[PDB]
């Protein structure tokens, strides 16, 4: 039972970390390799570069 609980918690944390990593990859693609016009996506104000 202890092993099952540990594995379930690890799986949930892995899902959360994967979501965060996907967001980070999107930010890398959109804010560093180009100029973004989305509001408050690459900082506060008018984005220039990153």
């Amino acid at each position: 039972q202890s092993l099952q609980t540990y594995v379930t918690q690890q799986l949930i944390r892995a899902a959360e970390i994967r979501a965060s990593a996907n967001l980070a990859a999107t930010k890398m693609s959109e804010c560093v390799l180009g100029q973004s016009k989305r509001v408050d996506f690459c900082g506060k104000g008018y984005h220039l570069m990153s």
């Binding site: 099952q4 799986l11 892995a14 970390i17 996907n22 890398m28 390799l33 100029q35 220039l48």
Partner: protein
């Protein structure tokens, strides 16, 4: 226990899937480009100072000062290195939790990509975005002077180029001051890097 089914096979499969997914996430994040660009030996970009983010060749690991501060701020327990059984049998009368975990069948695996490779990827991205702008992200890299690129960016945000070309020194000084304040702001705050510490 042999007659209780195959739960442990499922446990091993789930753990292996998580382990593979971690490396997949790292590769997806940090491997955007497949070319290793290099910065020019002469560091002059119209008055813009990039010394705080470019790699430092003096130190062996070739990391920028900001990266040095970031790596020194975060404390890591186990890095997946070789926690040799000899170290546990050393018997220094100070039994840590790592040896207790190891003696009960729990181990930590090292990541596929080292820190040096990630630093190399970051340096390549920085060189590409400094010497070419946004051209290298959609095809071959095209050279362009930095003030002209920043004028293009100001035109993108909705300001004419003569505004930039008549205030180059002030903009450069403001950028330099803003970059310089970043290290002090990061060092002064004790709980700036809370997310990674929580993860550990």
């Amino acid at each position: 226990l042999l007659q209780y089914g195959s739960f442990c096979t499922q446990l091993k499969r789930a753990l292996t899937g998580i382990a593979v997914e971690q490396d997949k996430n790292t590769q997806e994040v940090f491997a955007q480009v497949k070319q290793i660009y290099k910065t020019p030996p002469i560091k002059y970009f119209g008055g813009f100072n990039f010394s705080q983010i470019l790699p430092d060749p003096s130190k062996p690991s070739k990391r920028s000062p900001i990266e040095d501060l970031l790596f020194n701020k975060v404390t890591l327990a186990d890095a997946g290195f070789i926690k040799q059984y000899g170290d546990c049998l050393g018997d220094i009368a100070a039994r840590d939790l790592i040896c207790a975990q190891k003696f009960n069948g729990l181990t930590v695996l090292p990541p596929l990509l080292t820190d040096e490779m990630i630093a190399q990827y970051t340096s390549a991205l920085l060189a590409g975005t400094i010497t070419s702008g946004w051209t290298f992200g959609a095809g071959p890299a095209l050279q362009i002077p930095f003030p002209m690129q920043m004028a293009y960016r100001f035109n993108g945000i909705g300001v004419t180029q003569n505004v930039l070309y008549e205030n180059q020194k002030l903009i450069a000084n403001q950028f330099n001051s803003a970059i310089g304040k970043i290290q002090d702001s990061l060092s002064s705050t004790p709980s700036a890097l809370g997310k990674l510490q929580d993860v550990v």
